[PDB]
Amino acid sequence: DEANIETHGMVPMNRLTDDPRWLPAMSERVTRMVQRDRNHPSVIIWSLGNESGHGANHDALYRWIKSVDPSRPVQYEGGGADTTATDIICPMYARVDEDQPFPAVPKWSIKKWLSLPGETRPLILCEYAHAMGNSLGGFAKYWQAFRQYPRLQGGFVWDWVDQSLIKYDENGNPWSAYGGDFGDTPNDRQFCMNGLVFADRTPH
Amino acid sequence: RRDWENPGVTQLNRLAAHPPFASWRNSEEARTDRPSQQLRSLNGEWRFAWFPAPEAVPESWLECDLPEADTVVVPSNWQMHGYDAPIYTNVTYPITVNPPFVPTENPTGCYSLTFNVDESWLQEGQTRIIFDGVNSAFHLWCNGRWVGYGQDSRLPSEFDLSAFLRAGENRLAVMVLRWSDGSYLEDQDMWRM
Amino acid sequence: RRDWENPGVTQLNRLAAHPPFASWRNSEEARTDRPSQQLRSLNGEWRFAWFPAPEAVPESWLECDLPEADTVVVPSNWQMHGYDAPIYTNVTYPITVNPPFVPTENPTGCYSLTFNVDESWLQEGQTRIIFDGVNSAFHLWCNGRWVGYGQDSRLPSEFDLSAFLRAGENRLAVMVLRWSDGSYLEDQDMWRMSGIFRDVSLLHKPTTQISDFHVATRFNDDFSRAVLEAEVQMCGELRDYLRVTVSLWQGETQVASGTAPFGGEIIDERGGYADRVTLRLNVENPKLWSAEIPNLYRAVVELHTADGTLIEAEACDVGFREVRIENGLLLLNGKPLLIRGVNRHEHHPLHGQVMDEQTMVQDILLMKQNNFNAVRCSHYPNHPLWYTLCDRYGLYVVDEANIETHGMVPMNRLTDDPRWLPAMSERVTRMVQRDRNHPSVIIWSLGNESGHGANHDALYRWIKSVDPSRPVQYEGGGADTTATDIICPMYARVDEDQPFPAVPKWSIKKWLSLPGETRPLILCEYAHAMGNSLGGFAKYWQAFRQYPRLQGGFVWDWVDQSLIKYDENGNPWSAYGGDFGDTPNDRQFCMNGLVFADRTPHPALTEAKHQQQFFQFRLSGQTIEVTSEYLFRHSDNELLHWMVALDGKPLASGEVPLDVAPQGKQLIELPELPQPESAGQLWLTVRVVQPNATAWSEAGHISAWQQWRLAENLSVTLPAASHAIPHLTTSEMDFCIELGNKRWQFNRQSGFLSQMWIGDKKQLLTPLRDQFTRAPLDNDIGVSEATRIDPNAWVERWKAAGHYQAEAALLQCTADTLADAVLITTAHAWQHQGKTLFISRKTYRIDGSGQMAITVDVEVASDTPHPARIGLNCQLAQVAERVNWLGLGPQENYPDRLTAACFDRWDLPLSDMYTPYVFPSENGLRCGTRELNYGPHQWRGDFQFNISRYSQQQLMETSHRHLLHAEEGTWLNIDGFHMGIGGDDSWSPSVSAEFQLSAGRYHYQLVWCQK
């Protein structure tokens, strides 16, 4: 269960999440979520949000959840996927064997990540295998790794269903539309369609 | 107050959050998860009108239905009804980055409903309204009197209407802002509705 | 909009918090900390009108001064001007507990000021106003237009007035509410006041400006090398020509300097902070800061174009020090501290909660003069100058958030509620943002007495993320919760556990070793110094020195919160709770100070000084071993003075230089000393004297002392025979003895010495009789009240057992004439409702030399509460100027509070033998006395005594010192034994067993003679 906090377009990404003035608004997105959903057994891990860098507000909120509900781990991928605000190393799109050593927030091969000096946490990708159009190449590589390494405990594919919207042609015949199709601009075109199933649930 | 351009104001008069409730007044019905007569759905046909900014909404709408409004299904996203366009942006915010401000042109959805309650609800007890999801921020009025305000598009906002209710027909007026300081925390890669 | 009844609204339009700015436009002025033309004070005469509620203020006041307003000085608390009463409540809130609402009758202070702004400030840049302290919440208008709102009574609220001002005259309107939702977080045990009580200032900053800066100092393993890192943030016009130069100075020498353009390192996938820059300066062999040697450097932060134009400069004093807890110890620069601390509220008896530089300096001088090295800001951030003064004079500081919700039930009701996380977060985050660059601040505290709530855990973590340089502590919820790096109990005793459910207060020695515990323990409050207190203080210091992880504590507290009131004749007098009509109130609980409100010391201050000494002494033969407890300095301003005396008569003395390294020892072999053959006890007294004056002390200041007994020659010499013999005359009612010019009369009905004559003058106004009680000290009363007795308090136990009202029953009264004396024998029983509480048997032997030897043997029933004292009292007819005694002194001292006293020959004016505690009680005792001289009388024995113009009955019946009246004559209380005064706390019995009079049988003897 993940709080409704994503500040991806800020520069740098933690501009708001490291600012105390935004601690109140952020806090309610996390605390109210826990107050509502804490008795559901299906919820096994809480997440502080998505793509909002790593700010001190995250640390404060991680601690608040750990105090109020020790029954579930808290994860959060921002700021490098293995910060002090996450109990699980939870990268997005880290590859199996190939490192991508970006500055500040490298995406190590998941097998290598596990064993970095001093690291001991489990690793479950918050997102992997971006299923945009003709994709899923390399999927078996992940699975073979997950089975061989105890600490690689899986991941969540990105994502379930294409976000395409129905438009109708002059004839009244519907068609699947994507970014820009409604005159919206700037837009990010087909980036909204990443699913394993089409919008009407037909499998890809 | 432009409470929608102030991150220190995320709600006004909103009740505390809590796990799903139904106020069952019979233990066996609660055991079986059956319907509770104390929890009613207001889903269905509402009245709605679109405005270009909150400054364009007429005061009259607080007390009376606008004749130019349409009858629409709620819940709904208004873009899905064709009132304005849904926007698909991934990373870059759909509005100018200038926290905590939002565009002066801020699509405003004015929703309204006429309803009545059981006599016993007028008699005693607490009657609250629950909006499980309103994107992105909104003001609420009941029988023309202001009740409260809420933000966070993805959790329920609840308000006590006990003191606002009256015998006979009652009227909710809900002014929903497309954009608010809440939008700075809602930059997920998905359609902006 | 009742924003003052909504914890979700703690400000409107308020600017971000940041460290002290002055926007100098010249770098040398910033380096020298000279005044800045860009930072003006608006303090002075303002206009003020009081209203009973915000609904009563007229609209016109936004634009025009109210004719009926008064002109008053700001800063001020309006109760100090008499507009309404200050309220003294301890725990119970001053308003009905119904969050977030406050009373509809909410005293409202309407302040206004017409002031000047020069056009130059408005031609460019930004002009803001700064209110350093407004209690409790306020709305601000400028030239009739609404600007904004703020809460948090103890941190600065700033607003940009750029768009509201005009050249020349402008008018501010400030509506201050006494009560607001912020009051639920401000329930500290102090006077409840309100107003614009800290400075108001106007600051001009350029449009492109330094918006924040943080200074850090990191070291290598032996502190021989450091790196100063300064993160600087800007607001305004970001362009590539901008640079920041940070330069570090030691006096007029520039030690290091770095310059860089803006743009910090990449921190995430979206890049870095284009508006920040971090400068790193290497500094070799830095001079380190500590409370012992407050070495400071000056960092000047210049914002400028690369080609050389200074835009503005900000600056701070920097103290190179590392604070870290390692292996269970709190270390400063790698050494374990020993906290000689005190809690200090901001209090002035005439000005209320308004602090002034003179008062703060007076306080720091006295603290350091009395061996304190640390202060806790109980319970809120202090006036900004305080930190500068602690950085410069050298005191370790615990900076504490303004969060106290003591009156809630349970105490964490608000702190565990996420709805109050926002209001609490601001009180913690804004304090850190403001005070994070002061070296004096060594530990952050999350507030006080607000239980333990999840909001404390969230905030503990916030500070640990943003400022890893200082430990965070918090006592709530049992003093050792997950929200504290230091076990920091209040009033935990040294040896005695107090196992309350949920939040027990273990013995501090036991607490450190509980299963799994490893943190250091420093009491946030201990030794409650209310009234005649500080009993057992030495017990804490012996423990602190013996156990490494016991690293000290902060006494509660520095200064009594008494306020000045004036009587009909216009004479000032010290008032406490309820004295202003305030009710409910907590009476004298506001006076818990080591010093009176005007800074005169209470006697307990000298006990603290002595136990907090920085030199320890041991004696072997005539070799003195001095050990230094300083961690960083050599004893470079110190000499040892030594004196040997035979019972008060000086025989020899000398001085020797002290040269002891920190944590080192020096051995001092004294000269072949004075070896007299004459009777008496020889004694050695040593004192550490600072020959040179310092910033905080004058030349010759005494910083430490210690006394030991040397050889004792017991007297075996027989008094010469007397050339005489007293004569006895008897009647049914009396026994009269005469010897020359002297006469003694013993009443046969009461069994007491009723009158004595010298020459032919009567000496007593009241007979000499046994006394088993005392006018109860604050610690003996605790929280007991007549409307709500606390039966466990000592005073209540004594009262219920009948000690105060027992009557002497005569059991025997006889007279015998011996070879050279007359001997009177008596026995009395004191009973109460059937029960014999005490039996006093005595003999009075009057010999041919005129001396009267009195032997007293008392029995005290094992089942009656132990008595306050076992002694005699009488009212003497004489009133003499001076009191001269051979015994402990010179200041008041009690059995569990006499370590600082020295045995010598003392001579003081009578008035000095009375301690004017605001709430009167037994006071002025001196123990260990061998000889007492008053007028023609001399008393010899081994007793404790007090002497003054006030009876014990009068002291117990009078609530305020100014209502006391000298009685005829002088009341003398001479005790064989006197109970401890206690003080580990002032709300439960605290006198240690070893200081209670539980022996059952007691013996004492005195000789009363003339001269």
Ligand SMILES: OC[C@H]1O[C@@H](O)[C@H](O)[C@@H](O)[C@H]1O
């Ligand atoms: O389709 C691109 C995806 O990129 C990820 O980085 C992200 O967390 C997802 O929400 C989605 O945007």
Ligand SMILES: OC[C@H]1O[C@@H](O)[C@H](O)[C@@H](O)[C@H]1O
């Ligand atoms: O005089 C009683 C003292 O009690 C403590 O428990 C408290 O933290 C202090 O502020 C003061 O009230």
Ligand SMILES: OC[C@H]1O[C@@H](O)[C@H](O)[C@@H](O)[C@H]1O
């Ligand atoms: O001469 C007076 C001295 O007598 C000694 O016996 C005693 O130990 C000292 O404390 C002091 O009373």
Ligand SMILES: [Mg+2]
């Ligand atoms: Mg595009």
Ligand SMILES: [Mg+2]
């Ligand atoms: Mg808002």
Ligand SMILES: [Mg+2]
């Ligand atoms: Mg994203």
Ligand SMILES: [Mg+2]
């Ligand atoms: Mg408020």
Ligand SMILES: [Mg+2]
């Ligand atoms: Mg220069």
Ligand SMILES: [Mg+2]
């Ligand atoms: Mg000009």
Ligand SMILES: [Mg+2]
């Ligand atoms: Mg308190």
Ligand SMILES: [Mg+2]
């Ligand atoms: Mg009372």
Ligand code: NA
């Ligand atoms: Na695995």
Ligand code: NA
């Ligand atoms: Na996408």
Ligand code: NA
């Ligand atoms: Na110690």
Ligand code: NA
């Ligand atoms: Na007190």
Ligand code: NA
């Ligand atoms: Na010296």
